[PDB]
């Protein structure tokens, strides 16, 4: 008999912890939102590791200390809070805003997303997570998104890079999913123009598949003129001394390629519609990786009931 | 429904397959017949129309790729007769040593495949076909299936290249489907070892889809350690200065990725099962492309009866 996500979590008080790590301006929140939208406000609540800064915006500047350092964050208090949450206990947690705010009384939900620079920077913190994601875009893409927001700021970037590699980058080595967005081999311009990027999803050996989850490509449609280009591939690679398989999507696909995937995810979460969260005319690599990631969480939650 | 369309229709569907010697035509022709069945499909090799045998051609220092070395005018006469539904008497060339054989009687079938060096080498001949295919493998690939396949070959290859470009290559521009094979972006040894090559199928403006034909890629399996590498992409290139779109397949796909496509072909042809005709453990770019073209033929036959 097929298994059901909602069946698995109703009978259990188990708190599923999800970590989302990455450098600032790394596009972390686009994935945090994705998980929330897809799973709903009742199942999901999140926390940002920023709430655990030891120093405030002001003092840090005077100390010339950057937030990328571990000793610049209350990682001991975070681990303390997370362990309590897992046990289902309510917690009183700090709150950042550019300064400290009134502490909060945060209470558990079936799914909690811990998003920040060091969600699982230590072995102790790592061992608490049931699912970890690391967002690692290419340098040129990431800094562009920075200018698009903020040369005028070229020092900040290069200045903090060594800290990022020393204190944030390691988490990449122990993440259940690693996402790297780069420029499409169809042009950098397609990046902000149509949000078409060459996205890659890297994951360790798949230990379990609770159900078929298929992408349906019509082999007659792609021959029609006006048909948009796309590339989908999967090849083995060995990042950070570890074996992984990388799914690489590029270009755009017709919405009909993911109708079943969306329907199957909706039925499972009982949250719909979710087609409102992606493009109406064409589906991109980021969109597809968002659904795969989301399905990987359901899968992983069901694998856990077993 | 395919089977019933060819029911009350004396019409003869003429399929042409051109390409240099040792390019896989013969094995592509065989795949089609396996899918449409021996009762519906019949075939002819244009080689039966050589005017000079192997011994003679050596003396002359001539190559069989010349139009003047072939009785193309007879082939055309035979084809027109065949299309009208009349039995013909045609020549036979025994490749055992390169000698002429005894003439044969060939009576029309509703599907006739004409595979050879010059199936439609003349504007006149092209006019008779309903669907034309050009197999165009890369040089090292094309020669491999020869120099190691069978130094007569060496010297004969040097001697043919010019004639190829002059008497065979022109057909590629007027073909409905162009198939290009080159060494896989993976093991260039896998071509001989697992029939894994990088295959590209180009066709002009795609309009009219008898029905949906979709490839079902499972997005969980591909992350399984035992999963094989593959890539699927669709671009728009312009060989011979014309607008075509190309499906590029490389690597291996699981068999169930094409289970529905197979069942849909089996349903229309009445011939089954057809999984005996392709990898039993893995699908190659070549297995898939054969399925697609046999499906384009059906689609072409249903279209023609509209």
Residue numbers in the entry:
A (entry chain B): 3 to 99, 103 to 155, 164 to 319
B (entry chain A): 6 to 155, 164 to 319
Please quote the authors directly.
Archaeal PRK homologues show approximately 30% amino acid sequence identity with PRKs in photosynthetic organisms and form a clade clearly distinct from those of bacterial and plant-type PRKs in a phylogenetic tree. We analysed the specificity of the M. hungatei PRK (MhPRK) homologue for the known P-loop kinase substrates pantothenate, thymidine, uridine, cytidine, ribosylnicotinamide, fructose 6-phosphate, AMP, ribose 5-phosphate and Ru5P, but found that it showed kinase activity only for Ru5P.
Each protomer consists of an eight-stranded mixed β-sheet (β1–6 and β8–9) core surrounded by several α-helices (α1–α9) and β-strands (β1′, β2′ and β7). Conversely, MhPRK (homodimer) and RsPRK (homooctamer) differ in their quaternary structures and manner of dimerization. One interacts with Arg59, Arg62, Tyr98 and His100 side chains, and the other interacts with the main-chain amides of residues 27–31 in the P-loop along with a water molecule that interacts with the side chains of Ser31 and Thr32. Except for Arg62, these residues are highly conserved in all PRKs; they are responsible for binding of the phosphate group on Ru5P or ATP, as shown by the X-ray structure of the protein complexed with one sulphate ion in the binding site for the phosphate group on Ru5P, as well as mutagenesis studies of RsPRK. Mutagenesis and structural studies on RsPRK have also identified other residues responsible for Ru5P binding (His45 and Lys165) and ATP binding (Arg168). These residues are also structurally and sequentially conserved in MhPRK (His55, Lys151 and Arg154).
